[PDB]
Amino acid sequence: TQTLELNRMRGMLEDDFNRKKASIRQAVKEENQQLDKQKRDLEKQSNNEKLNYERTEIDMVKTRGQKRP
């Protein structure tokens, strides 16, 4: 009975340790998923901003007609 009381100790401790480590790994996976959104969004913002700026530049250039004094 004592050796069973102790083997269940070992078993419970190990089947808790492993679940804890797997939880840590899942948390790291979530952290990387989160980090991905930064490079997903900053690039979108910079793309839209380049679009706006270069469109405004095209406009300002094209807005040169004739003077006719």
Binding site: L51, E54, R55, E57, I58
Partner: protein, 420 residues
């Protein structure tokens, strides 16, 4: 990543180029300002797209031509090089004295564009072979670029002179002088002649007043379909080099024939449901190609067919097998399975099926034979020969060119007659 520069030349080459660019813009969903609604176009500020093409000619008329037609603002003035004189049907005026002082500059605008790409699958040229400007300038340019980048392939979408319905009186000289040099530094001389184009546009579409716009549009459709299987994914993909490998057996039997499908008029449109065997029957008909040479009068060394749309590949391959096996006489024996297929996945604008057929066939030596006939008939009298002798050109180059032409046609004949 397999890009293509699109060099032009001469008035006809420039017209065909403008038509091709507007058709490609139609397919790729671009509007005449260059906004969506890398193989051909190039990205540019403000989401704009500019074609990767250069436009050369000795007369500035074609400048106003390509500016006047729609989709003329897609191009860039850095690729608008233009002389002043215009060759006026003097081939030498496009190869030795006047054209030269332009081609140098053109080299820059070529290398101002070639290195812009990273894996340049090859060039492609659009010009005529009778006009001094197109023929001469394009020939010198082919020389230069084949000296420069021998690794890439140089398609020449050339329009050979109208054999019987001649519009100029100096066609044979320029055609022969051009072919003599084209046969060396080219890889795909797909010939077109307005005789076949009028034949098609008359007896296949019943059209009323065929202007040059319609012929250019037809050649544009064929030009697009040629490489569309590379422009898009497909169940069995090809490129500009698989074609070359499967089409030429020797370094100088590389002169092709072009065919498009399907083509019908309204009355005939309301009938004849679209199905791959019908497309085959319309594609392998003799009068349905861009060359005034009944292909039955020769054999097919080899021939590739690129389909565009959604179909059943088994039906494609079985139709190809049936058509090569039933008419075994017109095909050549010493090579087996001499037909080739490919299939894309995006057909043209609203056309649930499309076929583009390219065939290396010894039935086209007759065209060169008759052109050389006109040449030799006009040369033994030295007719209109001073116009060329005046430009440093001699009389040895002409007989050398004619002898090279006859050597080429003798090659076609000799290795048509061979057996196993």
């Amino acid at each position: 990543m397999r890009e293509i520069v699109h060099i032009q030349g001469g008035q006809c080459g420039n017209q065909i180029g403008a038509k091709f660019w507007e058709v490609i813009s139609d397919e790729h969903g671009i509007d005449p300002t260059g906004t969506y609604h890398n193989v051909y176009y190039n990205e540019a500020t403000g989401g704009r797209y500019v074609p990767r093409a250069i436009l050369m000619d000795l007369e500035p008329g074609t400048m106003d031509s390509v500016r006047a037609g729609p989709f003329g603002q897609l191009f860039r003035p850095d690729n608008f090089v233009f002389g002043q004189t215009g060759a006026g049907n003097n081939w030498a005026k496009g190869h030795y004295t006047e054209g030269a002082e332009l081609i140098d500059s053109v080299l820059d605008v070529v290398r101002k564009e070639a290195e812009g790409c990273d894996c340049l699958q090859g060039f492609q040229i659009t010009h005529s072979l009778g006009g001094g400007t197109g023929s001469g300038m394009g020939t010198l340019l082919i020389s230069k670029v084949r000296e420069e980048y021998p690794d890439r392939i140089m398609e020449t979408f050339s329009v050979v002179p109208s054999p019987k319905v001649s519009d100029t009186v100096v066609e044979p000289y320029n055609a022969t002088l051009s072919v003599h040099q084209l046969v060396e530094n080219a890889d795909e001389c797909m010939v077109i002649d307005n005789e076949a184009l009028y034949d098609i546009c008359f007896r296949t579409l019943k059209l009323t007043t065929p202007t040059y716009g319609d012929l250019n549009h037809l050649v544009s459709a064929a030009m697009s379909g040629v490489t569309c299987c590379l422009r898009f994914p497909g169940q069995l993909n090809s490129d500009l080099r698989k074609l070359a490998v499967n089409l030429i057996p020797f370094p100088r039997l590389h002169f092709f024939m072009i065919g498009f499908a399907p083509l019908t008029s309204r009355g005939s449109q309301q009938y004849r449901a679209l199905t791959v065997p019908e497309l085959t029957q319309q594609m392998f008909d003799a009068k349905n190609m861009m060359c005034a040479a009944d292909p039955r009068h020769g054999r097919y060394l080899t021939a590739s067919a690129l389909f565009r749309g959604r179909m059943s590949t088994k039906e494609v391959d079985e139709q190809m097998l049936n058509v090569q096996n039933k008419n075994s006489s017109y095909f050549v024996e010493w090579i087996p399975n001499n037909i080739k297929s490919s299939i894309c996945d995006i057909p043209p604008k609203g056309l649930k099926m499309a076929v583009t057929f390219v065939g290396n066939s010894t039935a086209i030596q007759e065209m060169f034979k008759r052109v050389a006939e006109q040449f030799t008939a006009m040369f033994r009298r030295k007719a209109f020969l001073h116009w060329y002798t005046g430009e440093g050109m001699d009389e040895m180059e002409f007989t050398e060119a004619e002898s090279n032409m006859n050597d080429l046609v003798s090659e076609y004949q000799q290795y048509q007659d061979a057996t196993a």
